[PDB]
Amino acid sequence: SIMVHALRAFRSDPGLLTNTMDVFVKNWYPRQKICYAKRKLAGANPAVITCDELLLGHEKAPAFRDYVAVARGSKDHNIRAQEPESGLSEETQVKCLMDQATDPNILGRTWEGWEPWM
Incomplete structure (x- = not known):
């Protein structure tokens, strides 16, 4: 519920942050990631951006078909x-963002050093 109170404060006015985040004048990896940032500050789903990233050239690694099936989950x-x-x-935004982070079927297949068990 603290994230209800936090994300609402940003989502209400997407210009303020996204327009500041055009600081990346320094394709443009800036444009195609800000293209996603403008969607996720607006109403867009967390697993969808993960699928969208895996579609963005990473489809060359063989498990991409399965990485999306982990991201999209089971209906x-x-x-x-x-x-x-x-x-x-x-x-809906945060309700889903919980599920895509807490999934035991992500955590049961992931990097060591980084640590799901702590």
Whole structure:
């Protein structure tokens, strides 16, 4: 619920931060990642951006088909998977962003050193 109160304060006015984040005048990896930032500050889904990243050239690694099937989850029992891609309220946005972070089927296949068990 603290994230309800936090993300609402940003999502309400997407210009203020995204327009500042055009500081990357320094394709342009800036344009194509800010293209995603403008979507995710607006109503867009967290797993969708992960699929969208994996589609963005990383489709050369063989498990990309499966990486998307981990990101998209199972429509039977993952609470992200039933939602649309875009137009999400602060509730739907964060409700799903929980699921895509807490997934035991992500955590059960991931980097050591970095640490799901701590």
